[PDB]
Design an enzyme around this catalytic site. Structure first.
Site, mmCIF file in Angstrom:
data_model
loop_
_atom_site.group_PDB
_atom_site.id
_atom_site.type_symbol
_atom_site.label_atom_id
_atom_site.label_comp_id
_atom_site.label_asym_id
_atom_site.label_seq_id
_atom_site.Cartn_x
_atom_site.Cartn_y
_atom_site.Cartn_z
ATOM 1 C CG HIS A 125 -2.263 0.820 1.060
ATOM 2 N ND1 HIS A 125 -3.239 0.533 1.571
ATOM 3 C CD2 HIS A 125 -2.164 2.214 0.312
ATOM 4 C CE1 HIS A 125 -4.368 1.599 1.116
ATOM 5 N NE2 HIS A 125 -3.465 2.480 0.355
ATOM 6 C CG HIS A 157 -0.630 6.776 -1.326
ATOM 7 N ND1 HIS A 157 -1.638 7.173 -2.004
ATOM 8 C CD2 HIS A 157 -1.023 5.692 -0.463
ATOM 9 C CE1 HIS A 157 -2.761 6.619 -1.419
ATOM 10 N NE2 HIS A 157 -2.647 5.755 -0.584
ATOM 11 C CE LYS A 210 -6.865 2.105 -3.520
ATOM 12 N NZ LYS A 210 -5.712 2.919 -2.942
ATOM 13 C CG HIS A 269 -8.918 5.933 -3.788
ATOM 14 N ND1 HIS A 269 -9.780 6.671 -3.397
ATOM 15 C CD2 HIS A 269 -7.863 5.628 -2.868
ATOM 16 C CE1 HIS A 269 -9.329 7.088 -2.218
ATOM 17 N NE2 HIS A 269 -8.367 6.510 -1.894
ATOM 18 C CG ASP A 305 -10.600 10.282 -2.950
ATOM 19 O OD1 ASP A 305 -11.576 9.692 -2.214
ATOM 20 O OD2 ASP A 305 -9.582 10.853 -2.445
ATOM 21 C CG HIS A 346 -10.182 3.709 -0.646
ATOM 22 N ND1 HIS A 346 -9.401 4.488 0.074
ATOM 23 C CD2 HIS A 346 -11.483 4.241 -0.447
ATOM 24 C CE1 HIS A 346 -10.008 5.471 0.605
ATOM 25 N NE2 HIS A 346 -11.294 5.423 0.475
ATOM 26 C CG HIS A 394 -7.724 1.264 3.965
ATOM 27 N ND1 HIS A 394 -9.083 1.296 3.166
ATOM 28 C CD2 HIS A 394 -6.928 1.833 3.024
ATOM 29 C CE1 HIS A 394 -9.027 1.801 2.386
ATOM 30 N NE2 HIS A 394 -7.868 2.444 2.138
ATOM 31 C CG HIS A 404 -11.486 13.602 4.043
ATOM 32 N ND1 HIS A 404 -10.486 13.026 4.094
ATOM 33 C CD2 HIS A 404 -12.469 12.663 3.270
ATOM 34 C CE1 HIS A 404 -10.520 11.845 3.610
ATOM 35 N NE2 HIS A 404 -11.818 11.653 2.953
ATOM 36 N NE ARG A 416 -12.311 7.124 5.969
ATOM 37 C CZ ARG A 416 -11.375 7.561 5.020
ATOM 38 N NH1 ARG A 416 -12.255 8.199 4.003
ATOM 39 N NH2 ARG A 416 -10.081 7.551 5.032
ATOM 40 C CG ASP A 473 -3.182 4.337 3.012
ATOM 41 O OD1 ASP A 473 -2.753 4.855 1.890
ATOM 42 O OD2 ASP A 473 -4.224 4.095 3.655
HETATM 43 NI NI NI Z 1 -7.671 3.838 0.526
HETATM 44 NI NI NI Z 2 -4.016 4.652 0.228
#
Ligand code: NI
Ligand code: NI
Ligand code: NI
Ligand code: NI
Ligand code: NI
Ligand code: NI
Lengths: 566, 100, 101, 566, 566, 100
Positions: free
Chosen positions: E133, E135, E216, E218, E220, E245, E271, E319, E335, E359
């Site tokens: 994981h 980034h 991936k 995600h 978003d 995700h 996660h 966020h 969350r 992550d």
């Molecule tokens: Ni995620």
């Molecule tokens: Ni992530």
């Protein structure tokens, strides 16, 4: 018209008969000769000599040097001379008089549009140092040595592994190949040593064919007569050098047994004094022999009031001895001896020890080969006075004797003196520029193959390069493909013939070692003494022709607390 | 903080001067790098205070005397130069013959 | 003890020995300062400097290498010149020679 | 439905008619236009617009951009506009409206699976800076300039050598070849300048054929009329630029003599004000000429209460003058002049000086080209009020006039505006993202050829990228082969035709300079003024049409103590 | 003759039946087996075993290993065993008994002239960690993870861009190509993830063909059933993995809707507990499914008294929520849940969660995967006592269960277990040497492909490598062409067949992923539990077969303040 | 100052020891890296003062006691080693079993 000699020296650096103190030592050099024509010196700057039609001519690039070091005070084994130095195609073009043949007399270094200038007036210029006792424990040792003024590193290892922590060995074709590849990333010339300890010659020939320029026999891999004999047989076949760390334990024989195993063949004896390793207590006797090229490692250089306490404990820590076991204590006391550590300094002064080296991060300091060589010269002038060879009211011969220990003599020992080791025409332009106040400790400019590779550098965002903080920063000669062009990876003849450079895609310029077997003690520049040396088995006293060889330990040294932040 | 390379490089200078400051407080005669660091950091703080370049070229000559430094150190330091952010931007301060 | 100090041998150095020399009177008729370096072809200096340019042909200032002589507006000096050597070929400057002499 | 303009600006960044303060200066920009369709803005994140079937479409990679900067406030010579920016194949694809044509109106920047997002709402986006007065004293200058927002560096040198400390010259084919090789290691586009001072044109043609994109004439190599004429003749043949640092000493002639030698040919005059070098006291008069592209170096920008004390001493230190010799003092006083330093700021404000630059570590600060350009704009708004060209209650025209000085005008001067210098379709995607509070001083993201090359970055081991310490760290656009793909090495036409890139195995993308001779003062974007300028020989006063040009020195500047740790 | 077991353990490291505490935790391992012949152990050093004709033989390089780790205490999923480890051609040759067959019995790891030695007596040796994981926010994450003991990094990104700050996605052929090029510069094995969110399969096939080993999905970018279905269809065609995700917002459906969209196909759920993202509040229910490979990210590992305060705020900051908007607060509270964060630790202990991961810099700490895995094991032993599988008075099975979470299970999940993930013959020699007191926190030596790549290192200029300051420094395995030889870039089958490595001139060794679709929960080593798990919609309580799954938060953890300077 | 790499590396050690010194002054029990840094920096200052290697091998054992450090820290530090420039050049000081 006339100029006073003080004003001349301020403007162009010293000339014939002027003397210069080396850093904060008691050593003084005297300018022996000056290759200029007075009034025709070249200087660069506003309104200065090196300008179109003046000190700079109309010639094409093929007809002028790429770089001129103006008004350098050269310190090399062959002389202490004032001269301009010309560099062309990464090599030393000439030592002489630079300028424009169109308007100036006696020009031997033509300056043209294609010529860069390094101003060496008031500076001392030397060859780059050559350290032949490197343990490749970590790659950070390369910048450390380069900053100290060392441009070539010969040694062995694979990183921070037990074998490498103890020995200068890069074992086997696979690790040899990986280390030659890693070498392209470092701004120093490199040659590797393989593991010499084996009694099957083919396991040695394979390592030489993979790229090593020498083989290290170390007692931790078994420095037996059969292993030594095998390594020398292969060395004689393949024109590579053998470096030796002998049997301290006297397990296989005493020093005379190792000498018999060598059988008059050429060999480089590492840390010949023996604190760094070797037949206890008498490995130092090897310097009597015509076929032995003897080096010291540096923590015993020079003898000081903290040397013994430091070493006895340093050895106890390295070997996991513990002061409670009488036999471990007996081992430590047989290896660390004030008698041989004190004699070693005198043996260097007499030219009986021929090279200095580090033994990097394995009982040796990688940034201190040069400054400790000078500390020994200083301590020896203080205790012994003038050398018998000395002419004039100066220390010129002692200076030439000592600079040869970390320049030309390591190069001759490892068969690379055709490429490096001195300021001589046709050799790679590895040069170090020193301000006299910092000679031997902190160089002003370190040049690799004609490009500046590292130098002190001030604030990057400042209006000029001199504001604080000033610290060593890698330059363009240490960047990617420019670095590859400006360094050498040394290979054996067998590896070069087998196309190792092409197979491994080595990017740097390649050089090939030669003359590792023909070199003898008599070839060590200014350091060819073969004394009739003995060591008493009970007291450890060193004698030459029955005369005690000893010295006194320093309380304070030059090239120390005045210069370093820690 | 978004520290640029030049800001991080000045941290190195500030730290070297802390080494020298503690040693001078113990009554040691300072050496070459300690002396350069101590006077250079003093100048950076004067620029942060809003002192003029002209004033600091003079003030920098009264930080260390020959009695406070090892033999030869004054001769090893013919000048000290450092830049810092003054209220009117970066400027160069050169302190000539700082130790007498 | 001073680290890296010189112990200069006292005396004098004679410059450009055996070379032909001449003296010329020069005046700066311009309104801005003119400074001339040791190796510049003196006959091709700024035209505001007035002197015997024929006498100066193939000469440079007879001063320490890298130094210069300054002429403020209206300043007059008698300077000593020394002949160029080597091939005695002049290229550059105001492009008045561009060859031998 | 409706949204308040304050809430809109908070969510998407400012729109038409909103104003933004530039950092802590008195300069205000006003959004002139907005290319969005209100309600159809693209934003990335959880529940946001750029999601499959929404603001992200179904198109193949060939049919969408690789990168979109959303809601950018563009500041460029051509406008202060709100828009999305699309990048594709390392180049600027479009300035417009991004999204998905399947569900959104007016989409000109398609977003697909293959599109990365940079969120530029609330940020100012500019072209990368172009510094054309670099001395390659050390390679560390590249990261220093890149962090400041400069993506192209044009200059000369070989490292910390006397010639380079004084001049932007990379002398000769050998050093030119080594520096082009070193350039592949640096995360900035590079073009080199050769040594222009020679009267044999072939010694110049050889340097251009080796790779230089220009030739520097510097007085330290003899800035004589014959050398200048030779360099211009070669430049006209080979489509490369000539940069000039003229004869301060007036040794060969006065400024009118150098102007006659130039003979109306195109030339870039460095540090035109003259503190950095040039005919004393009147080199500034060169900005009247149609064939001259005049730049300033930065320590004189803007005029402050510490400028003179600093410079008089800075010059004394660089030239080894000593305040005791009256002639050395007379030289220093003829070069450092409050009259020309004060006039220079006004000449920039009027568009008579066209470029800004550093003169890096040679009377110039490599990280300060951009912030000092803005400090001058601020000081000029404060002292002069609105420019005559100004429309609206904003400083938009002054902002466009000044940004052109370090972006498009250096690119046009050096024949690289076809590749870099502005945010325009087809140009390399060298972009700088700024938070308005740090505009001009500390950028948020620096993009090279479509990849982020450097940016502030917090604790590597932190749960998010924002925790302390935050400092600039090189990114993937500065790593090995990705860096090579994302930077340019500029070559001359002759070097490109001769296969220099292949011969030297240059790894980076190559660009070729063109248009170095056709460019004139009238082509300098927003800075084409040719004033009838004079300098009094006795008082040094600068006049335009007999009117005194002067300014007052700042006590305090913006973009200074609020931002920097030292 | 005999030796006491205490003296034996001091000299060679522990043997069968001896126990070792893991760092400062309450976890104890017990040596299960020892592959030596007592009296025939190999040790390197002065007077030691590994010497010519003794423990070192006469064999040619092809007939001996390149590297031997002597007397290692192996901790791996398959056993806690004492053995010598042989490495040859960058791969694990054998686990057994090293020495010389000429004089020693039972030799399975021949030592010759070509063999380097790493002394592992008294050390624990493990496989290199595998973090799936990542980034790619910045390249500095590679050294950070490598120092922690992680040798493979699988993830996505392009640098510090919004898309990458939020998602492990390298969008499109262009960025994929640039990141594969950048990967050659980093001393870790890398595989990339593309952007999976699209409903046109060709926009996914293009990314896999460009080089990505997975996709991936995600939220978003829109984690909708159609996007998930498209990515899985492509994954099944191209033998690459899908990482998920899920839709936290429940915008497109609830967790059962995403599970229906997956339709029993293989997928890696990131996660899985859900604080890091996913259907609120019940994404954790995914671990019941046979086709799901569930990982945790690390900030919730283990549950502590500062976890909730930290996360509630961490989410609010990421966020841009602001505690004043009730709906933003309602989102944050849906969350971040103590009920699922506490259950997650127990689910790891039971083998229901199979992998750990970071992550990195996106709600995760890149240097803390390994130490947090051990902190969870410790907290679970403290709260739960012995696992049902435990045999003997030790924690061996719990240790094997947990080490598999960051080694073999991430490798199996991403189709790279044929190359990495465990100490097994034929696998790449990615190995980590630990001093027991620093197990899991600060390794002694990190080996990449047979070369030491990073290790603690003391003063470079010191006489030995151990004097202060000791800090992690890159070694020869992290330098240029040696690094390329010693790392892997993973490609998809399609990218390898299309000649991507040759087209991009990738320099590192290449490996190809396979088995991404056939792998299931039942294949997760020691972590194959498929619990009948539920989450109450109102209270968030986690139950397995109606039994509450919970734990208590730690006030103090091991592997924390005793070790770290900050 | 012309700082070499090794001089800059010792700045890092000096700074880490400043962290530990401030924490010990607050009455905290020091951890592993703090303890190593504190004793190592103490030795470097003793070398700068001109103390002998033998004297510092002993003095270094009285900087921290078991009561001043966290549990297990004395066992984690069987020795501390550091080099510094003594009046007679660089030397190695090894402090055996420094914390009891
Ligand atoms: Ni995620
Ligand atoms: Ni992530
Ligand atoms: Ni040895
Ligand atoms: Ni050694
Ligand atoms: Ni200039
Ligand atoms: Ni310049």
């Amino acid at each position: 018209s006339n100029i006073s000699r003080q004003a001349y020296a301020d403007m162009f650096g010293p000339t014939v008969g002027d003397k210069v103190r080396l850093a904060d030592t008691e050593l003084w050099i005297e300018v022996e000769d000056d290759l200029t024509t007075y009034g025709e010196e070249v200087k660069f700057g506003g309104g200065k000599v090196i300008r179109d039609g003046m000190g700079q001519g109309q010639m094409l690039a093929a007809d002028c040097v790429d770089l001129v070091l103006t008004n350098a005070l050269i310190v090399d084994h062959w002389g202490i001379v004032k001269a301009d130095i010309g560099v062309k195609d990464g090599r030393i073009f000439a030592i002489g008089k630079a300028g424009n043949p169109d308007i100036q007399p006696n020009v031997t270094i033509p300056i043209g549009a294609a010529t860069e200038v390094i101003a060496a007036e008031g500076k001392i210029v030397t060859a780059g140092g050559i350290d032949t006792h490197i343990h490749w424990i970590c790659p950070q040792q390369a910048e450390e040595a380069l900053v100290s003024g060392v441009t070539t590193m010969v040694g062995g290892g694979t990183g921070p592994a037990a074998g490498t922590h103890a020995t200068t060995c890069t074992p086997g074709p696979w690790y040899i190949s990986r280390m030659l590849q890693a070498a392209d990333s470092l701004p120093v010339n490199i040659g590797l040593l393989g593991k010499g300890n084996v009694s099957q010659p083919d396991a040695l020939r394979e390592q030489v064919a993979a790229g090593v320029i020498g083989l290290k026999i170390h007692e931790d891999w078994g420095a037996t007569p059969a292993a030594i004999d095998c390594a020398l047989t292969v060395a004689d076949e393949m024109d590579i050098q053998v470096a030796l760390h002998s049997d301290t334990l006297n397990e296989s024989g005493f020093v005379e047994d190792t000498l018999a195993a060598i059988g008059g063949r050429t060999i480089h004896t590492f840390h010949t004094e023996g604190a760094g390793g070797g037949h206890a207590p008498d490995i130092i006797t090897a310097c009597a022999h015509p076929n032995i090229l003897p080096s010291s490692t540096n923590p015993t250089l020079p003898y000081t009031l903290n040397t013994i306490d430091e070493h006895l404990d340093m050895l106890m820590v390295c070997h996991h001895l513990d002061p409670d076991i009488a036999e471990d204590v007996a081992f430590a006391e047989s290896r660390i001896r004030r008698e041989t550590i004190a004699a070693e300094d005198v043996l260097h002064d007499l030219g009986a020890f021929s090279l200095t080296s580090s033994d990097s991060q394995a009982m040796g300091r990688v940034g201190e080969v040069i400054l400790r060589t000078w500390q020994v010269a200083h301590r020896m002038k203080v205790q012994r006075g003038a050398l018998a060879e000395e002419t004039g009211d100066n220390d010129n011969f002692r200076v030439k004797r000592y600079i040869a220990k970390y320049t030309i003599n390591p190069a001759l020992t490892h068969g690379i003196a055709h490429e490096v080791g001195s300021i001589e025409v046709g050799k790679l332009a590895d040069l170090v520029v020193w301000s006299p106040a910092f000679f031997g400790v902190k160089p002003a400019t370190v040049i690799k193959g004609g490009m500046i590779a590292i130098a002190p550098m001030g604030d990057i965002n400042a209006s000029i390069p001199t504001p604080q903080p000033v610290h060593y920063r890698p330059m363009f000669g240490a960047l990617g493909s420019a670095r590859h062009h400006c360094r050498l990876t040394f290979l054996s003849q067998a590896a070069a013939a087998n196309g190792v450079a092409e197979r491994l895609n080595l990017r740097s310029a390649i050089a090939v070692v030669k003359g590792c077997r023909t070199v003898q003690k008599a070839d060590m520049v200014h350091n060819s003494l073969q004394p009739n040396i003995t060591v008493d088995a009970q007291t450890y006293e060193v004698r030459v022709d029955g005369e005690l060889i000893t010295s006194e330990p320093a309380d304070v040294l030059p090239m120390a607390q005045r210069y370093f932040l820690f | 903080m978004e520290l640029t390379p030049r800001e991080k490089d000045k941290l190195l200078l500030f730290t070297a001067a802390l080494v020298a400051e503690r040693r001078l407080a113990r009554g040691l005669k300072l050496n070459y790098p300690e002396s350069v660091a101590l006077i250079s950091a003093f100048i950076m703080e004067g620029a942060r205070d809003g002192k003029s370049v002209a004033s600091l070229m003079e003030e920098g000559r009264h930080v260390l005397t020959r009695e406070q430094v090892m033999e030869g150190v004054p001769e090893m330091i013919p000048d000290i130069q450092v830049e810092a952010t003054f209220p009117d931007g970066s400027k160069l301060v050169t302190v000539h013959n700082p130790i007498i | 003890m001073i680290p890296g100090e010189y112990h200069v041998k006292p005396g004098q150095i004679a410059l450009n020995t055996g070379r032909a020399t001449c003296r010329v009177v020069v005046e700066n008729h311009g309104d801005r300062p003119i400074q001339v370096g040791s190796h510049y072809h003196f006959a091709e200096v700024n035209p505001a400097l007035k002197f015997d340019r024929q006498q100066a042909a193939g000469y440079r200032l007879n001063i320490p290498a890298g130094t210069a002589v300054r002429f403020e507006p209206g300043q007059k000096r008698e300077v000593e010149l020394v002949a160029f050597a080597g091939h005695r070929a002049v290229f550059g400057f105001r492009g008045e020679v561009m060859g031998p002499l």
